[PDB]
Every structure is written in C-alpha cells, then in structure tokens.
Amino acid sequence: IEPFLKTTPRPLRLPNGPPCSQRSKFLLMDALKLSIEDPSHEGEGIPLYDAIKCMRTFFGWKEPNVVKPHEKGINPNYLLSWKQVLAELQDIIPKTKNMKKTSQLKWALGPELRSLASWIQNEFNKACELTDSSWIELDEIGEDVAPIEHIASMRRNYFTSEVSHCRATEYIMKGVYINTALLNASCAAMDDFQLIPMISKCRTKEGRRKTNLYGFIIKGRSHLRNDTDVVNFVSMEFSLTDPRLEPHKWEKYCVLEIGDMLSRPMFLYVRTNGTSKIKMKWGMEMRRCLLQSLQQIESMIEAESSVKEKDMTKEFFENKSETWPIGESPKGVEESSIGKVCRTLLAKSVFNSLYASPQLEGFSAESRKLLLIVQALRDNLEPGTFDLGGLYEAIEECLINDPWVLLNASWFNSFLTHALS
Amino acid sequence: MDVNPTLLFLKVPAQ
Numbered sequence: 001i002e003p004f005l006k007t008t009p010r011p012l013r014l015p016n017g018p019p020c021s022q023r024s025k026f027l028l029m030d031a032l033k034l035s036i037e038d039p040s041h042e043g044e045g046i047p048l049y050d051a052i053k054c055m056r057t058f059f060g061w062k063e064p065n066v067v068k069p070h071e072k073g074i075n076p077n078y079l080l081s082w083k084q085v086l087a088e089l090q091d092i093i094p095k096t097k098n099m100k101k102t103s104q105l106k107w108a109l110g111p112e113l114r115s116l117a118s119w120i121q122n123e124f125n126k127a128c129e130l131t132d133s134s135w136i137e138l139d140e141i142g143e144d145v146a147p148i149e150h151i152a153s154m155r156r157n158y159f160t161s162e163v164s165h166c167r168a169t170e171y172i173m174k175g176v177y178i179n180t181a182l183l184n185a186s187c188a189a190m191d192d193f194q195l196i197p198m199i200s201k202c203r204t205k206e207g208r209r210k211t212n213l214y215g216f217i218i219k220g221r222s223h224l225r226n227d228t229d230v231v232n233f234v235s236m237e238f239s240l241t242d243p244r245l246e247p248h249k250w251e252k253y254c255v256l257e258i259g260d261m262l263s264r265p266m267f268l269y270v271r272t273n274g275t276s277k278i279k280m281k282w283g284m285e286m287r288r289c290l291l292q293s294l295q296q297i298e299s300m301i302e303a304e305s306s307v308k309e310k311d312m313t314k315e316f317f318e319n320k321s322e323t324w325p326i327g328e329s330p331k332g333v334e335e336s337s338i339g340k341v342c343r344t345l346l347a348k349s350v351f352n353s354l355y356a357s358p359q360l361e362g363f364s365a366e367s368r369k370l371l372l373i374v375q376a377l378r379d380n381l382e383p384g385t386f387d388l389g390g391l392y393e394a395i396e397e398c399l400i401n402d403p404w405v406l407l408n409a410s411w412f413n414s415f416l417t418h419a420l421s
Numbered sequence: 422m423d424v425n426p427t428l429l430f431l432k433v434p435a436q
Contacts, residue, residue, distance in 0.1 A: 128424050189430055298435050325431045327422035333431070334422050344426050371435050379434070404429075411425045418431055 007388075009374055009420055012367075013272045019248040020403040024354045025179060025283070026198065026214065027269060031124040032238040033212035034058050037204065038259075045290060047181060048097055051091060051197035054213035058304050059267060060259040061086070067163055068243040068255035070271070076105035078270045078278075081234060085195060085216060096185070099218055100192040101396040108218035108272050109193070110232045111400055116410055119249045120403040127347035128340070133171040133202040133210065136160070136290075151311060155298045156319045162339040163290065167345040169353065172286040174200045174214070179283025182275060186222035190253035194219045198237065212349070214238065215268070230274045237269045280358065289349040297342050300324075325418075333418055343408035355404035362398040363405050366391060367412050374419050 034054040043049040064082050068074040081104050087101060099105060137160060144153065163169055178198050185194040199213040215237035221230045242265065243255040252271050259266035304322070305312035315336040316322050323335035326344060336344075352360060371392050377383045397407050 051427045077432055126422070198423060244430055296436070300433055303433070303436070324433070327424045327428065329422045341429075347424075348426050368435065371430060375430060381431060408427070413424050413429045414425055415427045415430060419429070 001179050009370075009377070010392075011416050012392070012399065014116055014399050014406055014409055015113040017113035017115045017401075018403065019183040019265065020114040020406060021251040022119070022122070022249045023252060023403070024271065025275070026174065027239055028354070029123050030241040030269070031214050032237045032240050032266070033200075033214055034238065035210050035212040037208045037210050039209065039211050046095055047197045047199060048064045048095060048195070050199065050211050051213050051216070054211065055089065055206050058259070060261055062257075062259055064268070065257045066248055066254060067257045067267070068253070070252070070254035070307045073254055074104075074107060077107045078234075079256060080104035081218070081257055082236060082258065082268055084272065085218070085236065087194055088195070096189070097195045098189060099419050101193050105193060105218065105234075108234045109218065111271065114325075114401055114403075114406075114413050117246075117248060117403070118405040119246055120407045124347060124407065127159065127166075127168050127171065127351060128224050128344045130343075131165050131167050131170060132205040133170070134164045135166075135200070135202050136164050137172045138201070138203050138209075139409045151313065152298070154313050155301060156294060158313060159297055159342050161347050162342040163293075166343045166346055168289070168343065168350040170202070171199065171268070171350050172289055173285040174198070175286045175354070176298070179275075182217065182219070182231070182233070183277065183280045183284065185219050186224065186277070187279070189219065189383070190222045191225075192219070192221075196233075196269055198235070206211065224277060227278045228276050230276050232272060232274045236268065236273050240264050240265045241267065243267065243269070258392070269305075282353070286350065286353055289353055291348060293342065293345040293349045294344050297338070297420075302343070328414060351404055357402050359398045359400060359405045360408075363395060363408060366395040366398070367408075370395065371412075371415075374416060378419050 034057050036053050038058060039050065039053065041053055059135050064079050066075050066079060073308060084099065148180045164405050169266040177200050181196050185196050196217040196219055198216060199212060201209065201211045217237065219235045220232035242263060256268040256270065257265055258268045282345065299317065301313055320337035320339065323337055324341055325333050326341060327334045373386050399406060
C-alpha cells in the first residue's frame with residue numbers, strides 16, 4: 001500500500017471558499033422572454049417599439065417588491081429604477097428613450113477564494129440542449145455563393161443542421177444583439193441614460209418569426225475615448241427562477257418580484273455592471289464560436305475518416321451510431337452521437353466567451369500539457385515517465401474564483417479518473 | 422447526464 005513513494009496522476013486541488021456566483025453579462029438558463037410572433041406592427045424592427053409590443057403581451061404585473069436584496073447595495077434604488085422604467089414606458093412615439101436621470105438611477109449607475117457549486121454545471125447542461133426555436137439561418141433562402149471545397153461545405157452544413165436550434169446559439173445571438181445595441185447607444189447618446197431593450201429574434205418550431213424581450217438595460221454616461229473606457233449600466237432581466245433556492249449564485253444582484261405568469265411568480269434580476277468598446281465588440285463577435293467549434297468538429301471528422309479511408313461525415317450525422325464519450329451519469333461515462341458533440345463543443349466555446357478571464361487562459365494552457373502527458377501514459381503499454389514542471393502548481397494556481405474555470409478543473413479531474421481507471 | 426466535454430479525450434487524441 002505504498003503508492004506514496006510513487007508520483008502518479010492525482011486530481012487537481014480546487015479551492016475552499018463560499019460557493020462561487022454568477023457573473024455573466026446577462027442571464028443564461030434562468031432567462032425569460034416576453035415575445036410576439038409574426039410581428040407586424042407599425043415600426044417593427046425598432047427596438048423600443050418591439051419592446052413595448054412584447055411588454056403588452058403580459059398582463060400579470062403587480063407592485064414590485066424586493067425579495068432577495070443585494071447586500072452591498074441600496075436596495076430601494078433598484079425598485080425605483082424598475083418602477084421608473086415601468087412608468088416611463090406608459091406613453092402616447094419616438095425611436096429611442098432616455099430616462100429622467102433620477103436620484104436612484106444616478107446611484108445605480110455609479111483575492112477572495114470561492115468553491116465550485118452545482119449551478120455552473122447545470123448551466124452548461126442547458127447550453128448543450130436543443131431548443132424548439134432556431135437562432136440562425138432565418139432569412140429567405142438562397143445560393144451559397146461562396147467558394148468552398150465540397151467536403152468542407154458538407155461538414156459546415158451538417159454542423160449547422162445540428163446547432164441551429166442549440167441553446168448556445170441563442171446565447172451567441174443574444175450577446176450579438178445586446179452588445180451591438182449597447183455600442184450604438186453608447187455612441188449616439190453619450191450624455192444620456194438610454195433605456196436599451198434586451199432583444200433577440202428567432203424562428204419557432206412552426207417556422208414563425210419571433211421577437212424576444214429578456215428585459216432591459218440602462219446605459220450610464222458614455223463619453224468613451226480609450227477603447228478601455230467603461231460604460232456603467234444597470235441590467236434588469238425577467239426570470240421565473242426564485243433566487244431563494246440558490247441565493248449564493250445571486251450575490252451580485254438585487255432581485256425583485258414583479259408579477260405572475262401562467263401559475264408562478266415572476267422575478268426581475270437586477271444588477272449594475274460595466275462594459276467597454278472592447279468587451280462589446282467581443283460580444284458582437286460571438287459568432288466566431290460557431291467557427292471555432294466547427295473546426296474542431298471537422299478535425300475530429302478528418303482524423304476518423306482517414307483511419308477508415310472514407311469520408312465519414314454523412315454517416316456520422318445521419319446514422320447516428322458512431323459515438324464519443326462526453327458526459328457522465330450515475331452509471332459512469334456516457335457517449336453521444338456527432339450531433340450532441342457539435343452542440344457541446346459549441347457550448348464550450350460560447351461559455352468560454354461568456355466567461356473569458358485570465359484564470360481560464362492560464363488553466364486552459366497548463367492543463368493541456370498535463371492532458372497530453374496523461375494520454376501518453378494511457379495509450380502506450382510501456383509509456384515511460386515524464387517530468388512535470390510545476391505543472392500542477394501552474395494549473396492549480398488558476399483556480400481562485402471563477403465558476404467556469406473551476407468546472408473545467410472538475411471536468412479535468414473526471415477525465416483523470418477515467419483515463420487511468 | 423452531466424455533460425463534460427473533456428471526456429472526449431478518452432477517445433480523441435488531443436488533436
């Protein structure tokens with residue numbers, strides 16, 4: 001029983017701390033849209049009008065109440081901010097809409113170790129799912145005028161058939177929409193408290209056009225000249241999730257009860273936050289995640305189909321019987337078809353865009369070195385031995401805070417567990 | 422299932 005003399009692959013020590021919390025620019029699994037189908041009102045397309053139209057699809061509003069106060073914050077300024085936006089909408093015709101720079105607005109508009117907590121893995125599982133709606137390929141259909149090899153467009157087009165209804169795709173489209181509206185407002189007003197509706201559009205299970213309202217953002221002042229100059233903002237986001245079941249996830253938020261829906265109470269997650277022309281541009285460019293994940297899908301498919309000396313694309317996507325380990329359940333490791341693979345590799349790329357951080361950039365470069373070293377131990381019956389740097393020390397040092405980074409560690413631990421069991 | 426995409430590497434040689 002002296003394994004204790006041997007150095008072999010242990011898992012990574014994650015940090016002790018109060019449970020990690022949510023920190024993305026907007027809500028993910030917890031989001032709630034009010035929407036309109038076939039929208040055709042006068043001025044459709046125009047955010048503020050579309051928004052007013054989504055707000056009128058709902059009749060359950062009640063008198064706002066704080067229900068999970070932010071504990072750094074002056075909570076009643078967040079009620080007054082909601083109430084203010086509610087008030088300022090009940091009106092008569094213009095395109096955009098600045099808020100009375102009231103007292104509670106002006107206020108609202110201006111390491112510690114934490115441990116892993118389950119909500120993040122649950123968010124990840126939701127991101128990989130199919131939705132009833134599709135989030136790309138929404139226009140009238142036409143030729144692919146665009147010069148691209150046969151097999152490469154076959155792969156691209158198969159992938160799209162698998163990711164177009166993926167929930168991670170809604171998140172890309174949501175970041176694109178919101179960030180680009182934010183850039184627009186930040187540059188037109190600059191001295192204005194513009195009310196910025198959080199929108200996406202999609203097409204439904206039946207094929208209808210649909211426009212969605214997740215909530216609203218108010219911009220602070222936006223005289224920005226460095227790319228790094230910061231726009232404060234307050235985001236207010238509808239949700240049906242009762243923040244009291246997992247109050248640790250909501251530490252950054254004041255949460256209000258604002259209504260009932262068909263029957264559950266309805267919540268508004270509120271928090272202040274900040275961005276810059278560079279972060280907004282990052283959001284605006286979240287379709288790169290479709291690219292990134294296609295390329296890894298394509299090279300998985302290359303590698304395999306070279307072994308078998310035929311193109312396997314068609315057979316992988318259609319028969320759905322080649323599979324790949326990609327998840328775990330109470331029975332051990334589970335394999336899925338190429339379509340779950342595309343959606344999951346999508347979601348990983350989207351999350352690590354939603355949670356970009358230096359801790360991620362470190363963890364992911366160092367852990368790759370260990371990865372290759374553990375696959376070499378695994379794949380070679382006389383593998384030899386390997387020098388770690390302070391590989392463990394370089395990796396483990398990235399594990400401070402970050403919910404996303406900390407799952408990735410947990411996920412890597414799982415792997416080590418199985419790679420060598 | 423809990424989805425864990427680093428479990429791919431039980432099968433896919435890190436490209």
